[PDB]
Design a protein around this motif. Sequence first.
Motif, PDB file in Angstrom:
ATOM      1  N   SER A  88      46.622 -35.156  83.138  1.00  0.00           N
ATOM      2  CA  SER A  88      46.773 -33.842  82.537  1.00  0.00           C
ATOM      3  C   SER A  88      47.922 -33.830  81.536  1.00  0.00           C
ATOM      4  O   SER A  88      48.806 -34.691  81.545  1.00  0.00           O
ATOM      5  N   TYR A  91      41.632 -42.484  84.898  1.00  0.00           N
ATOM      6  CA  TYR A  91      42.808 -41.642  85.071  1.00  0.00           C
ATOM      7  C   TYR A  91      42.770 -40.498  84.068  1.00  0.00           C
ATOM      8  O   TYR A  91      42.911 -40.722  82.862  1.00  0.00           O
ATOM      9  N   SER A  92      42.582 -39.273  84.549  1.00  0.00           N
ATOM     10  CA  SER A  92      42.568 -38.102  83.674  1.00  0.00           C
ATOM     11  C   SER A  92      43.931 -37.414  83.702  1.00  0.00           C
ATOM     12  O   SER A  92      44.110 -36.336  84.270  1.00  0.00           O
ATOM     13  N   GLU A 144      50.963 -33.648  83.162  1.00  0.00           N
ATOM     14  CA  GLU A 144      51.168 -34.946  83.796  1.00  0.00           C
ATOM     15  C   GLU A 144      51.751 -35.941  82.802  1.00  0.00           C
ATOM     16  O   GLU A 144      52.672 -36.694  83.132  1.00  0.00           O
ATOM     17  N   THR A 148      45.455 -37.503  88.737  1.00  0.00           N
ATOM     18  CA  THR A 148      44.132 -36.954  89.001  1.00  0.00           C
ATOM     19  C   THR A 148      43.066 -37.617  88.135  1.00  0.00           C
ATOM     20  O   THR A 148      43.250 -37.817  86.931  1.00  0.00           O
ATOM     21  N   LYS A 149      41.970 -38.006  88.773  1.00  0.00           N
ATOM     22  CA  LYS A 149      40.863 -38.667  88.106  1.00  0.00           C
ATOM     23  C   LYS A 149      39.798 -37.631  87.773  1.00  0.00           C
ATOM     24  O   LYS A 149      39.649 -36.626  88.472  1.00  0.00           O
ATOM     25  N   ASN A 150      39.060 -37.881  86.696  1.00  0.00           N
ATOM     26  CA  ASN A 150      37.941 -37.010  86.354  1.00  0.00           C
ATOM     27  C   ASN A 150      36.716 -37.328  87.205  1.00  0.00           C
ATOM     28  O   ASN A 150      36.842 -37.963  88.256  1.00  0.00           O
ATOM     29  N   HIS A 175      53.328 -37.831  93.465  1.00  0.00           N
ATOM     30  CA  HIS A 175      52.360 -37.482  92.438  1.00  0.00           C
ATOM     31  C   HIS A 175      51.138 -38.387  92.533  1.00  0.00           C
ATOM     32  O   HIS A 175      51.244 -39.573  92.854  1.00  0.00           O
ATOM     33  N   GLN A 176      49.972 -37.815  92.251  1.00  0.00           N
ATOM     34  CA  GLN A 176      48.731 -38.562  92.102  1.00  0.00           C
ATOM     35  C   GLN A 176      48.153 -38.309  90.718  1.00  0.00           C
ATOM     36  O   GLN A 176      48.115 -37.163  90.256  1.00  0.00           O
TER      37      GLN A 176
END
Length: 51
Positions: A32, A29-30, A35, A22-24, A19-20
């Motif tokens: 989800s 760190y965005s 997530e 996800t960044k905006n 897993h990564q």
Amino acid sequence: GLTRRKLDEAIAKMEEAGHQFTKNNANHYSISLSEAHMLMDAAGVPKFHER
DNA sequence: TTTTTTTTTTTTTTTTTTTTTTTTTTTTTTTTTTTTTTTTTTTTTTTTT
């Protein structure tokens, strides 16, 4: 309701997997919504029923 | 005696939350104008001297 240390423990247990986080548009760190669910699912916090 | 890698200092950038000010819209508000009921004034006829 997870303290910073607890959340770093959770992401130390999780992130090394495929897993990564996800960044905006920025590096922030965005995480989800799904997530976040997965993170705290396997973070070790027992659910309101499983506890 | 030299070299490599990692854990600490510090530095830079972004998002979210919470700071202020202005305009538009809405509410309470007396002055002016308009509407209705009215007490005083004017006209005619009948009867009596």
